[PDB]
Amino acid sequence: KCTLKSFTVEKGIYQTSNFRVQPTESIVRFPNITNLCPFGEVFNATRFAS
């Protein structure tokens, strides 16, 4: 009814896609790390590179 925008439907076959037509997709997490990154060694260097 929603797919045809009609409250009444005739005899036949009708296509549709709405119910989730693929099974349980879901996304989480990453590979791992060992330290905080060394930004302060550049950002608070005494004098920078040429």
Partner 1 sequence: LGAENSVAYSNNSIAIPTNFTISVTTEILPVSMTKTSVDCTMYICGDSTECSNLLLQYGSFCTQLNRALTGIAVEQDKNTQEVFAQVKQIYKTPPIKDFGGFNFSQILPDPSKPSKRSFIEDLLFNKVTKFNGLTVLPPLLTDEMIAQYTSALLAGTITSGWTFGAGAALQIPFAMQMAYRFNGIGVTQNVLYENQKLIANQFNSAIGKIQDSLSSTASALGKLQNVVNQNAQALNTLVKQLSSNFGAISSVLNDILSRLDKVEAEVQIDRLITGRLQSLQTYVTQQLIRAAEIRASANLAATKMSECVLGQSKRVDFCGKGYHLMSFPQSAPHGVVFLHVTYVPAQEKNFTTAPAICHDGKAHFPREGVFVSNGTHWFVTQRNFYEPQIITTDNTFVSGNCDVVIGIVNNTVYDPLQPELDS
Ligand X SMILES: *[C@@H]1O[C@H](CO)[C@@H](O)[C@H](O)[C@H]1NC(C)=O
Q: Which of 17, 34, 44, 50 binds ligand X (CB under 6 A)?
A: 44
Print the SS3 string covering 24-50. Answer: CCCCCCCCCCCCCCCHHHHHCCCCCCC
CB 30 within 8 A of CB 45: no
Residue 42 interacts with which of ligand X, partner 1, none, CB < 5 to 8 Å by class: none
- Tokens read off for 35: 């330290």
Among positions 11-40, residues that touch partner 1 (CB under 8 A) are 15, 17, 21-22, 25
Residue count, binding to partner 1 (CB under 8 A): 5
Kindly state whether residue 48 participates in binding ligand X, applying the rule CB under 6 A.
no
